[PDB]
Symmetry: D2
Subunit: 329 residues, 4 copies
């Protein structure tokens, strides 16, 4: 008999219980993978990409670290059979933006990628929650929702989670306080058009807007509006300096994955179907504070916005619908 | 100011558990993320020669602060940023191209070390040095010679990764988690590494006793192939993704953990093995070491078979050959 | 209107089934140490507590709930009725007052049918003493396959042994390997042949290891394991922290399907000349289906005889039990 | 030669100073809950335990030591002699016997013994009445106010957030609310700062925390007080919730996180308080203890409860001999 048979007596012959799939093993996908592995959120990790060499190499590199991890099974493949029975599927797959090329071009190029991915994911994990990271995240969340046929609670966009995370870091740096104790919400459209909700900004329940009524206005001597401007600046700066962003997004995604996998019911700024709110009548996804758990977005926090903040959200929803109506599905 | 209206200042201290990472490439950054997610430091310093990459990497880590428990992340080309580090991790250096040997990088990484090591020692004279840059065994010796530090404070990542990979492969063959599969890969980190077949066990049950052909050419199960798979492992990963990062990042954080927490765990790491196995030269290679707050305080004297001791001295002879032809 | 309705807009109605639920039966010193350790290791999305003393039970549940801000287990429940334990992945039995096998078999006769009724697919983790007999009792009453009925067995004995080994060598217990097998407690067997640091056999280096002609008296380390148990009980009246931690470690392998090897009590019929339905500790592979595999340890004639003697004793008691 | 010498080659002799040492004084239900929580959060490289009951102390130490295989704290020590506490970064006082003079007398022995072995430590006071006993520890130690911290309203605040969470169907982490002033019966819920995702509950419901409230949110604070008495009535004491809240404070101190916590501090100069009185306000907590304070703007009613508490505490404090 084999050494295995000489050493081990088998009792049982024969599904993963807390499986997570990462689609796209680029810099974002891999940072999501390592963060999830170090937070023990899954009993099985699946990786999918179209570049087979890179995919196998990334899987092997992770597997070689098994001794230091508590995720006993790490798999990869171009075939979505490796994703079967995932509780959560994270989409970080995307086309590399060409020089000159417009952003509407990239939208459709990523829609074409999504037209192949989403049916393959839903076929192997029909009851999964979809977590969209790929840009433009608000449009691609809508695309994922339309293709999948899933109820809106199971289609989550990373949205303004990173924007809010960056805002809190910058707030923290200005005040000499840990970002955990600095509260502030960046809502609406992820990226350039995001809305800092000045009314909600506080340390220990002390409203910064109450203490300083000029907060977030051009009338502000301290120019706190620059803290939101810097959120936008930092994204461009990181890309200019290292060519991409990975660690910050990976960490923010693992945080969302934690609330879903552990059914924590924490409130996060994530992209959801906001039709019926703030005068929005189109099928658009934008970030609002959402209760996140085992069934995805179960609830949403109704944030009271100023006329300016509400108009900004409306304008973003009109822009997103404009792109969404002209997409080829 | 709004800061003064909101916060009243009471006090107008040195970092207590500071770690520096030198070299922010794929290895350095994987070491950084692994250390950050294991809460090993109250302060993380990053050093590199590439300005842009350094600032970008620091900023990317800082933007994830909300999800971390390391309140201070700093970077700079000037080593004043590294002052009073408990542990300095060196990952700076030229890496293998597809198929290239680690010994081929020695000359240019030794020059890189001639600049780094004096700068690190100047700002952290009492730190422990953790060397990752390849060839790791020779570069650990180089760091030891340049620094003038006692041998206990100069640690090379060594065969820690080789042993982790071996245990993973053992685990996959037996259907057991690597944590429960015990086996030691010693000597040089690389082509001349030694799998110690005598110490391979699950729950104290010797695999060599149960299968006397273990690690021999007479083996029908070809267990010797598990070690070949360990030797080839970096070459295969380099061929597929162009470098290795995750596995080494994880193994370094494991060593950082034993040092920062003074655990006194036994790890296969690069060390001054003069006086052991008939070695009379200042050779650095992997043996099981007790790792704590003062680095390597103790060494485990592994009993090697005639053939296993042979293979280890072959590894030591190779490394000394390269080591001896070096001007400081 | 409610402030909840003014603040929160509901999207989903029906709240689903718990995915990673753990139940602790008996909220004594052992049960509560098991509970806090599992909570601080984030092994469960829901924790259920059961006891017969209703006031203590509610107080313990409330004390844990008040620490929620510092935890990642969003639901903590308790009750005398086993409906609170429904759909548990793992049920830990620490129930009964801390000779006493007959009163403990009788409470198991009430507890086990109640646990299996609400969680038919759970793994059973038995801690209550005599753990080896009570694991057999749980197996018989539940009707579960042997893989889903685990006794804490020699896990604590082995942990204590490794601690003492570590202290003697100046090495962390994690790097000190040694297995204490068979019957939990006084009759446990230290397997001297498997004792090592970095794969270096202590018995090979010192052939007198675990013998009376040993000048270093390493046999005393096992003697100290037994002595320490009595000492802790003499000094504080019970043991809680060490058993709590060891149980959370078992819970981790099970919940995370790690397939790590642990010294736990299992049905060892067919091994070491044992022909009866007896549960004794051997190294077991632990995962989502409980004990899927067992490590066949090579024992000396003396070590094998000690297990056979323990098996004859345990079967003697077991034979006379009525279910 | 010994098996240890045959197996291990020693490189270093000198084995010195613990880098991240924590001491727990009083191994009762509170002390032991603090100990296990700190051990499971890997906050220390060394744990020291002190008590007057020698048998219980050794038994508790041994029970923790037997769990070493599952921990990352390589050294657990105990003793009646404070030599075991030398060079602690943090010293947690949970020792205890109206009741104030009995505890003051216990503190007159403890605090000098702690300060001589760990002159640079931060003192974390849990023993009740925590606000008076934090003042007592500060007076006896002679330490600057930044290094003398009372657990204060940390537990009150945590309980409040738990109850808020249960009412809203939201995790306590996402439910924000501050309970300040005097720990216990006289604690002040700051209704203005209560929010979920920056949405002020008082703005949405102006009747929040008043008797005019049809939803009776004032009852959530009443329930915080009710729950403390209930837990004591049901199990005889509280341990897990306090051990966890202390471990959270220990984390921000040991890791220099600079997180904001409701803890007891010397509040002379604030809210018209002119006496040396300790009570809870949101404090920035790090490696030097309380480095900063958040100046919370309070209503007339909230400020009145806090000043009233300060007058009462000073009344007791002036009538104490030490
Ligand atoms: N939401 C956020 O805050 C945030 C932040 C940073 C980046 N991003 C986005 O995440 C995406 C990925 O970023 P990146 O840096 O990792 O890009 P990347 O180019 O490095 O990686 C993308 C990966 O997607 C893969 N891919 C392409 N087509 C695929 C397909 N049909 N199936 C599976 N995989 C496929 C590629 O092969 C590649 O490996 C981008 O769209 C980016 O804009 C979002
Ligand atoms: N098991 C192991 O020990 C192990 C495993 C994998 C890789 N490695 C080694 O780690 C090293 C780094 O690998 P990599 O993939 O990160 O290479 P990399 O090219 O991605 O990064 C190397 C970094 O070193 C920096 N650097 C060069 N000179 C420097 C200087 N004088 N000061 C500071 N920084 C300087 C570079 O600028 C670069 O950022 C290599 O030597 C590699 O072989 C070791
Ligand atoms: N296997 C080991 O290594 C190990 C180590 C230590 C203790 N133990 C055992 O664990 C058990 C418990 O220890 P303890 O110190 O917590 O005892 P304990 O007396 O403090 O607590 C026992 C609890 O069981 C409860 N109980 C009694 N009947 C019950 C019933 N029908 N249903 C539910 N609960 C019931 C009691 O009310 C009590 O709360 C003992 O049998 C003890 O010997 C085992
Ligand atoms: N939110 C809070 O601040 C909070 C919550 C709960 C309890 N507490 C307080 O914590 C304290 C302890 O609670 P407990 O349940 O553990 O009490 P306990 O009676 O169980 O334990 C107290 C311990 O203090 C020890 N002790 C007495 N004198 C001592 C001395 N001179 N030196 C060292 N140790 C000594 C006792 O021996 C005993 O072990 C009480 O004052 C209690 O009110 C505070
Ligand atoms: O950090 C980030 N790096 C990004 C990136 C990552 C790899 S290439 C580009 C990045 C950065 C700057 C503009 C930018 O513009 C876009 C927007 C959509 C699109 F399809 C392509 C580029 N994208 C993607 C992204 O969304 C973020 S977050 C961010 C972006 C802008 C403002 C504020 C925030 Cl918080
Ligand atoms: O640490 C412990 N405290 C105990 C206890 C718990 C509450 S009151 C008594 C304790 C101690 C001594 C004998 C004792 O009696 C028994 C009874 C039945 C039985 F199967 C084993 C021991 N029980 C329970 C227990 O099993 C342990 S572990 C242990 C016990 C004896 C020797 C070695 C070890 Cl490792
Ligand atoms: O949970 C708790 N259990 C307590 C206890 C602990 C062991 S015996 C009594 C507890 C509870 C109720 C009143 C009570 O009264 C006292 C008695 C003596 C004294 F010096 C201070 C307070 N003590 C101590 C304590 O401070 C808390 S927290 C708390 C207490 C009251 C209201 C609100 C909160 Cl958050």
């Amino acid at each position: 008999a084999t050494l295995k048979d000489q050493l081990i007596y088998n009792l049982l012959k024969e599904t993963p219980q807390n499986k997570i799939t990462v689609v796209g093993v680029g810099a974002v996908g891999m940072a999501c993978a390592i963060s999830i592995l170090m937070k023990d959120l899954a009993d099985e990790l699946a990786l999918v990409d179209v570049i087979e060499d890179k995919l196998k190499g990334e899987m092997m590199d992770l597997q070689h670290g098994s001794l230091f991890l508590r995720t006993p099974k790490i798999v990869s493949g171009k075939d979505y059979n490796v994703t079967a029975n995932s509780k959560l599927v994270i989409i970080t797959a995307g086309a590399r933006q060409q020089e000159g090329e417009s952003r509407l071009n990239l939208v459709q190029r990523n829609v074409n990628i999504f037209k192949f991915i989403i049916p393959n994911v839903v076929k192997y994990s029909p009851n999964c929650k979809l977590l969209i990271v790929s840009n433009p995240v608000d449009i691609l969340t809508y695309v994922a929702w339309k293709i999948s046929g899933f109820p809106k609670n199971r289609v989550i966009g990373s949205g303004c989670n990173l924007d809010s995370a960056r805002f809190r870091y910058l707030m923290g740096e200005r005040l000499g306080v840990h970002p955990l104790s600095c509260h502030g919400w960046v809502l609406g459209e992820h990226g350039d058009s995001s809305v800092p909700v000045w009314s909600g900004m506080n340390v220990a329940g002390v409203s910064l807007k109450t203490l300083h009524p000029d907060l977030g206005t051009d009338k502000d001597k301290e120019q706190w509006k620059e803290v939101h401007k810097q959120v936008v600046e930092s994204a461009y700066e990181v890309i200019k300096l290292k060519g991409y962003t990975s660690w910050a997004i990976g960490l923010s995604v693992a945080d969302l994955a934690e609330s879903i996998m552990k059914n924590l019911r924490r409130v996060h700024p994530v992209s959801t179907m906001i039709k019926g709110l703030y005068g929005i009548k189109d099928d658009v996804f934008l970030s609002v504070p959402c209760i996140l758990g085992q069934n995805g977005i179960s609830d949403l926090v109704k944030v009271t916005l100023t006329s300016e903040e509400e108009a900004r959200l409306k304008k973003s929803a009109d822009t997103l619908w404009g792109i969404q109506k002209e997409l080829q599905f």
